[PDB]
Design a protein around this ligand. Structure first.
Ligand SMILES: [Ca+2]
Length: 123
């Protein structure tokens, strides 16, 4: 769910408030997404978006009404390391992995403020 993803990013980037810093960035970081990614951070979000779409393709997810944004899963942050729990069932485990990969991706690429609140005209 959104609140777990928020925590994962903070696990990797302790100085940020992810829901503020990484929302409405480029063409993909935020609700929806289209066009060509503007930079590598934006590409991280495109990959994350594709991961969520793939998750909704799984038979294990189409059984629950929980949406990737509201579906809770278990994970831990320890020494700034993210670990998805084995207690997670099929759907939750896939989502957890999508989020973990994105959080790590976010922490490895440059952040370009020029792309914040980008005009959808570019997407
Ligand atoms: Ca998106």
């Amino acid at each position: 769910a959104l609140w777990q993803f928020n925590g994962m990013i903070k696990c990797k980037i302790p100085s940020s408030e992810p829901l503020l810093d990484f929302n409405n960035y480029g063409c993909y970081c935020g609700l929806g997404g289209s066009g060509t990614p503007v930079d590598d951070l934006d590409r991280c979000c495109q990959t994350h978006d594709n991961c969520y779409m793939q998750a909704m393709k799984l038979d294990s997810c189409k059984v629950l009404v929980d949406n990737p944004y509201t579906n809770n899963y278990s994970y831990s942050c320890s020494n700034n390391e993210i670990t998805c729990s084995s207690e997670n069932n099929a759907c939750e485990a896939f989502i957890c992995n999508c989020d973990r990969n994105a959080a790590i991706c976010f922490s490895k690429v440059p952040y370009n403020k020029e792309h914040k609140n980008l005009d959808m005209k570019n997407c």
